Amino acid sequence: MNLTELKNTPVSELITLGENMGLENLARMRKQDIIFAILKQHAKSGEDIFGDGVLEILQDGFGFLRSADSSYLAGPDDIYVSPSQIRRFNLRTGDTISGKIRPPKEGERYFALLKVNEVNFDKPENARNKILFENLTPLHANSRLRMERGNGSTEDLTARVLDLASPIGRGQRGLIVAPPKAGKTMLLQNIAQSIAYNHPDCVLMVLLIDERPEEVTEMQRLVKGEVVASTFDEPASRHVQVAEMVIEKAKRLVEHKKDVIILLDSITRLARAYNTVVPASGKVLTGGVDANALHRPKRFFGAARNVEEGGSLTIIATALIDTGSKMDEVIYEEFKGTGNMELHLSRKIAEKRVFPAIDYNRSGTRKEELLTTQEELQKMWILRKIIHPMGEIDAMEFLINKLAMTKTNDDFFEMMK
Amino acid sequence: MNLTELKNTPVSELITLGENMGLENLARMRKQDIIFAILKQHAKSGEDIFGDGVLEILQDGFGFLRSADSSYLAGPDDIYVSPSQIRRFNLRTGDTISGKIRPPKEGERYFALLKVNEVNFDKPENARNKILFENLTPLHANSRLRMERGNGSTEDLTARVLDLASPIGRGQRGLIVAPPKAGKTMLLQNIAQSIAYNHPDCVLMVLLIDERPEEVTEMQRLVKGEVVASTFDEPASRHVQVAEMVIEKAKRLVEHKKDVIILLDSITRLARAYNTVVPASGKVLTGGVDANALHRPKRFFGAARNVEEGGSLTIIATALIDTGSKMDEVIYEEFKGTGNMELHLSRKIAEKRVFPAIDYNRSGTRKEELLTTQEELQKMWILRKIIHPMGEIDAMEFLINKLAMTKTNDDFFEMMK
Numbered sequence: 001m002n003l004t005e006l007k008n009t010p011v012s013e014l015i016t017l018g019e020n021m022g023l024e025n026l027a028r029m030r031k032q033d034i035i036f037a038i039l040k041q042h043a044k045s046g047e048d049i050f051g052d053g054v055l056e057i058l059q060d061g062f063g064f065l066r067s068a069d070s071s072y073l074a075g076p077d078d079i080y081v082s083p084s085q086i087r088r089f090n091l092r093t094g095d096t097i098s099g100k101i102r103p104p105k106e107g108e109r110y111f112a113l114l115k116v117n118e119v120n121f122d123k124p125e126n127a128r129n130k131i132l133f134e135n136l137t138p139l140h141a142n143s144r145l146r147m148e149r150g151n152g153s154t155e156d157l158t159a160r161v162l163d164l165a166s167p168i169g170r171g172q173r174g175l176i177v178a179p180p181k182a183g184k185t186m187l188l189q190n191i192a193q194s195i196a197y198n199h200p201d202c203v204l205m206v207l208l209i210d211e212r213p214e215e216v217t218e219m220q221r222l223v224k225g226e227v228v229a230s231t232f233d234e235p236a237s238r239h240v241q242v243a244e245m246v247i248e249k250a251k252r253l254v255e256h257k258k259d260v261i262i263l264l265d266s267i268t269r270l271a272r273a274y275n276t277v278v279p280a281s282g283k284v285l286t287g288g289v290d291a292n293a294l295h296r297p298k299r300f301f302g303a304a305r306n307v308e309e310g311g312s313l314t315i316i317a318t319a320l321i322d323t324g325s326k327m328d329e330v331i332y333e334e335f336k337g338t339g340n341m342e343l344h345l346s347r348k349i350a351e352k353r354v355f356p357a358i359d360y361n362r363s364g365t366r367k368e369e370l371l372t373t374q375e376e377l378q379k380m381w382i383l384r385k386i387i388h389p390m391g392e393i394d395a396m397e398f399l400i401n402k403l404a405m406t407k408t409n410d411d412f413f414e415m416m417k
Numbered sequence: 418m419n420l421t422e423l424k425n426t427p428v429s430e431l432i433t434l435g436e437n438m439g440l441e442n443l444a445r446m447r448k449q450d451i452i453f454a455i456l457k458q459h460a461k462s463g464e465d466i467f468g469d470g471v472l473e474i475l476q477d478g479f480g481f482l483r484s485a486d487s488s489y490l491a492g493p494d495d496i497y498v499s500p501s502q503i504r505r506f507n508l509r510t511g512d513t514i515s516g517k518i519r520p521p522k523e524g525e526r527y528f529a530l531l532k533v534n535e536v537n538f539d540k541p542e543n544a545r546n547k548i549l550f551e552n553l554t555p556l557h558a559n560s561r562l563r564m565e566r567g568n569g570s571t572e573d574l575t576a577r578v579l580d581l582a583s584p585i586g587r588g589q590r591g592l593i594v595a596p597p598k599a600g601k602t603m604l605l606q607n608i609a610q611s612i613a614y615n616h617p618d619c620v621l622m623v624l625l626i627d628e629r630p631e632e633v634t635e636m637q638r639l640v641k642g643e644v645v646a647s648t649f650d651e652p653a654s655r656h657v658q659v660a661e662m663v664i665e666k667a668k669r670l671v672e673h674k675k676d677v678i679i680l681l682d683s684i685t686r687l688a689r690a691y692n693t694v695v696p697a698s699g700k701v702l703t704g705g706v707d708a709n710a711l712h713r714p715k716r717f718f719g720a721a722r723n724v725e726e727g728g729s730l731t732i733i734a735t736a737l738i739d740t741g742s743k744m745d746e747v748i749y750e751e752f753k754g755t756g757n758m759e760l761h762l763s764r765k766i767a768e769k770r771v772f773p774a775i776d777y778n779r780s781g782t783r784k785e786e787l788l789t790t791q792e793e794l795q796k797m798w799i800l801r802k803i804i805h806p807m808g809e810i811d812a813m814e815f816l817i818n819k820l821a822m823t824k825t826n827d828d829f830f831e832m833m834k
């Protein structure tokens with residue numbers, strides 16, 4: 001008796017099971033209400049019920065166990081968590097809790113937690129003694145997260161160009177700067193697919209705030225990982241809540257020496273949401289940005305770091321420029337002094353239908369020698385010195401024509417000499 | 418005895434009928450008052466009266482049935498809908514209701530609804546069980562909505578250029594960016610005529626907010642569809658109300674697997690209206706735009722989506738640029754990074770009296786391979802690569818001179834090779 005197991009079951013089988021259990025007509029009923037009635041009827045027989053979810057401690061002291069399939073939205077099937085148990089096990093926002101639950105009695109509206117069985121997918125004896133995320137020693141990117149497929153596919157050209165322009169390692173904090181209508185969607189899809197193919201052990205999390213739902217359901221059915229999104233039909237409060245829950249879960253996972261990867265596509269939208277939810281202080285800067293509005297996105301971005309004791313946190317955010325709004329322009333670069341990695345995309349190259357439209361000149365990675373060998377770094381330096389004199393479109397055409405001849409970049413580097 | 422039937426009748430016949438029924442002199446009376454008196458006299462004999470309209474639920478709990486011929490304006494002949502029936506049939510704003518009505522008794526001012534016969538042009542048993550619009554899975558444009566006439570007319574050149582620049586499919590969410598005095602009116606008229614000619618099965622709705630009455634009555638007598646407009650003589654409150662009613666009706670139609678097409682021509686004017694009706698919060702951004710003013714137009718624009726279960730919603734809005742106001746430059750923009758189709762028009766080409774004055778270079782459609790075949794996409798790519806080096810005016814002249822030689826674009830593509 002698990003909550004996620006009943007959530008994954010279809011509607012027809014749940015209706016059939018409820019009709020066999022002998023309850024009210026479930027055809028004219030919601031799936032969540034059907035599951036609730038089935039759990040009630042199964043607990044009336046004396047059997048136990050189990051559930052799971054991410055903890056969201058409220059300001060009063062209690063909390064609930066949000067579900068991932070609903071993008072951490074407030075649902076009727078949330079499991080209550082009393083503050084007594086929180087105080088007894090030192091629980092915090094983001095801790096994954098899995099234990100026995102019971103249906104609400106007369107006068108209650110949510111399931112109660114009796115005994116916790118597993119904390120953060122581990123024993124509670126290992127979670128009671130742990131080092132906080134704020135005390136971990138940061139470090140630079142040491143492990144190399146190669147994005148090249150290696151299967152010789154035609155779509156691998158984007159990953160090869162990305163590796164030649166800006167290699168990505170564990171704990172990297174980069175930025176994907178690109179004007180609208182440049183190809184950010186396809187680039188993010190390719191990055192997510194390459195991460196899921198090359199490094200399936202890492203925890204991939206794609207955050208899409210204030211996006212077109214069709215794109216949400218497309219990304220959810222395309223990438224092999226977790227997708228937490230919030231369409232534009234929701235207020236900025238839900239955006240802030242989802243961002244907080246995601247970053248808290250990422251911190252709790254990193255605290256257990258896990259490799260978390262967050263592919264953010266709405267850093268600008270997140271900053272707009274934070275500027276909308278912040279109370280007015282009577283002081284407005286140039287472009288309509290509050291003085292204390294960028295602090296929360298600043299911390300959300302700076303949360304990414306590489307841990308020496310174990311694990312890492314990678315955050316790749318895509319910033320929006322040339323959107324016609326001065327607020328986004330002020331945000332983007334305020335954040336430019338940030339992202340230890342900038343991958344610029346050119347609109348002029350995208351208009352020529354030359355995919356990918358990557359600005360190789362302004363791209364780059366700091367401390368790239370820690371992720372590449374000596375000969376590889378020398379070859380990349382020679383390639384950059386050869387590409388720099390040529391124009392952007394000409395350099396992109398040259399790179400595409402030279403990478404189409406071979407499958408691996410090593411052969412291209414060997415033929416360049 | 419139908420309301421719309423009496424509304425379509427002329428004034429002279431209604432006056433004659435009222436004089437034959439033996440009532441007060443109807444020559445010095447309004448047509449609506451004449452219809453009201455005729456309905457009263459016909460109901461005094463014991464016969465039944467029927468009406469219809471779009472439901473507009475008020476904040477208190479009751480509602481009225483607005484009429485389409487009055488642009489959903491508050492009229493004396495609105496049918497009152499009690500909240501009891503709303504609670505009994507789960508009615509919402511936008512549901513088309515058609516049932517028996519009765520004249521108001523002593524102390525009443527509006528017609529009452531006794532029994533509902535048809536809901537959303539369908540049986541109530543099919544409307545009681547339905548999936549909300551917020552739960553439908555979005556998708557990209559799959560079905561091709563070809564705009565080419567095919568009759569070899571001289572006006573078909575605009576549709577041919579539009580198809581070669583940006584093909585339109587079901588569920589598309591585009592933008593027509595053009596400075597003033599460019600030819601937006603003729604272009605919108607041609608688009609509406611091509612939609613009514615090629616795809617007469619789709620529900621066409623043209624929304625004109627804050628425009629001149631002459632243009633309104635011109636569009637109403639030119640296109641073959643529904644025209645809901647609101648001239649500048651009305652406050653922004655009526656603009657917001659009309660936009661809400663139109664989008665709610667569109668959502669209710671899409672919920673019944675219908676293909677709705679909305680040709681918006683005032684996205685900038687709608688954003689200005691929303692910025693005017695929003696209460697001041699003491700925080701003004703660059704250009705005079707409120708922080709929470711663009712949220713409602715953002716949702717109105719993002720409502721457009723393609724449904725996998727059935728139906729679609731297409732919204733083609735025309736944004737205004739270079740109007741001398743910085744608010745529109747932020748308002749029209751901020752919207753640039755939202756849609757997935759931009760059809761730019763050049764003022765320099767319009768000054769040369771070269772119609773249509775379309776910027777073929779900056780135009781385009783994302784995921785265009787889902788609406789065109791392989792050979793068609795290759796021919797469009799070759800045409801774009803040939804047109805790109807030439808200047809805007811030169812490319813437009815070349816395209817016009819090459820399309821004037823033949824009737825179909827297939828012959829032009831075959832002759833280009």
Ligand SMILES: Nc1ncnc2c1ncn2[C@@H]1O[C@H](COP(=O)(O)OP(=O)(O)O)[C@@H](O)[C@H]1O
Binds near residue numbers: 158181
């Ligand atoms: N690698 C690519 N190959 C082919 N087309 C692409 C590629 N990247 C982008 N595009 C085209 O650009 C359009 C928009 O790209 P997108 O990633 O949505 O840009 P952004 O996210 O910056 O708005 C897509 O619909 C696609 O047709």
Ligand SMILES: Nc1ncnc2c1ncn2[C@@H]1O[C@H](COP(=O)(O)OP(=O)(O)O)[C@@H](O)[C@H]1O
Binds near residue numbers: 604
């Ligand atoms: N396809 C066309 N053919 C001929 N003239 C046009 C065409 N499109 C626009 N025009 C001219 O431009 C004028 C204004 O066009 P309009 O569509 O009103 O531009 P906008 O809507 O951008 O203000 C029209 O009065 C018309 O004379």
Ligand code: BEF
Binds near residue numbers: 756
């Ligand atoms: F319009 Be893109 F997604 F920035």
Ligand code: BEF
Binds near residue numbers: 596597601602737
């Ligand atoms: F003056 Be146009 F209608 F933008």
Ligand SMILES: [Mg+2]
Binds near residue numbers: 184185
């Ligand atoms: Mg995008």
Ligand SMILES: [Mg+2]
Binds near residue numbers: 601602
């Ligand atoms: Mg116009």
